[PDB]
C-alpha cells in the first residue's frame, strides 16, 4: 500500500553527482593510464559488475586506489563515469569503440547493448 | 548530444538498497531512541537536508555514529529510511503524524508536502 515519488531516484543521482563535483565523501581514486578519477565506491558498485566484484572483496574493499588495466582509455572511462552519475552517455563516432571496450571491461551491460546497436547501424 | 538510459537512476537506487540490505559499505549508524539503523552517508545526504548539513560539517563528516533528537520516533525514521533507498513511502493513518514530524526534522520537503496533503484530505 506504499505511494511512490516518481522523481526520487533521479533527484538522488543528481545529488550524488553534486557531491562528486565538489569532491564530498569520495572514498576511492580510479587510476586509468596515469589519469585519476575520484568517485564513491557505492555508486561505482551500483553501476558496474567489475566494481561490484572489486569492492565486495574482503581485501580490495579497503583500498583507496584502484588501477585499471593499461588497455583502458581514460576518455572512455571518463564518459562512463559521467554516465554512472547522470544516466547520460556522450556516445560519438570518435569514441564509440573506446566506450564499448571500457563498458565491456567494467561490465555495464546496458551501455554495451547500445554501443553494439549504434555500431551495427553504421555498417 | 548525449543519449539517456531511462531506468538508470532507478537501477542505481535498487542496487544501493541491495548493498544496504546486505550491510555492504555502510559507513554510519543512526541512533533513534536506542534503535540503530545502518546506512550510507552519501544516500542520507542525497535524500535529507539535515544529513546533507551534518556530513558536510568538517567534524561530523568523520563520525560513525549520529544520535537523532529523542523526540524522533524510530518507526517514522525506519519508514523514511526505506523511502530514501526505494522511492516508496509506507504512509498510513497510524503513522502519518510521526512520518511528517520526522520528514520535517530530516528536511525531506517532498515527503512533508505529501503528508500535509493527505492530512488536509482527512479533515
Amino acid at each position: 500500500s506504499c505511494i511512490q515519488f516518481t522523481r526520487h531516484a533521479s533527484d538522488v543521482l543528481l545529488n550524488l553527482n553534486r557531491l562528486r563535483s565538489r569532491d564530498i565523501l569520495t572514498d576511492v581514486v580510479i587510476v586509468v593510464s596515469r589519469e585519476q578519477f575520484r568517485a564513491h565506491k557505492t555508486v561505482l558498485m551500483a553501476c558496474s559488475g567489475l566494481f561490484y566484484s572489486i569492492f565486495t572483496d574482503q581485501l580490495k574493499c579497503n583500498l583507496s586506489v584502484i588501477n585499471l588495466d593499461p588497455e583502458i582509455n581514460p576518455e572512455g572511462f571518463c564518459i562512463l563515469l559521467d554516465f554512472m552519475y547522470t544516466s547520460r552517455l556522450n556516445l560519438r563516432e570518435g569514441n564509440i569503440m573506446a566506450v564499448m571496450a571500457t563498458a565491456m571491461y567494467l561490465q555495464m551491460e546496458h551501455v554495451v547493448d547500445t554501443c553494439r546497436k549504434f555500431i551495427k547501424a553504421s555498417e | 548530444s548525449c543519449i539517456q538510459f531511462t531506468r538508470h537512476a532507478s537501477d542505481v537506487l535498487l542496487n544501493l538498497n541491495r548493498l544496504r540490505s546486505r550491510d555492504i559499505l555502510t559507513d554510519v549508524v543512526i541512533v533513534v531512541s536506542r534503535e540503530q539503523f545502518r546506512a550510507h552517508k552519501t544516500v542520507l545526504m542525497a535524500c535529507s537536508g539535515l544529513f546533507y548539513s551534518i556530513f558536510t560539517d568538517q567534524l561530523k563528516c568523520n563520525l560513525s555514529v549520529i544520535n537523532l533528537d529523542p523526540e524522533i520516533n524510530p518507526e517514522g525514521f525506519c519508514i523514511l529510511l526505506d523511502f530514501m533507498y526505494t522511492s516508496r513511502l509506507n504512509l498510513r493513518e497510524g503513522n502519518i503524524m510521526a512520518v511528517m514530524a520526522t520528514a520535517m526534522y530530516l528536511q525531506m520537503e517532498h515527503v512533508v508536502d505529501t503528508c500535509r496533503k493527505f492530512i488536509k484530505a482527512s479533515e
Partner: peptide, 4 residues
C-alpha cells in the same frame, strides 16, 4: 506521487 503515484500508486506504483
Amino acid at each position: 506521487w503515484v500508486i506504483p
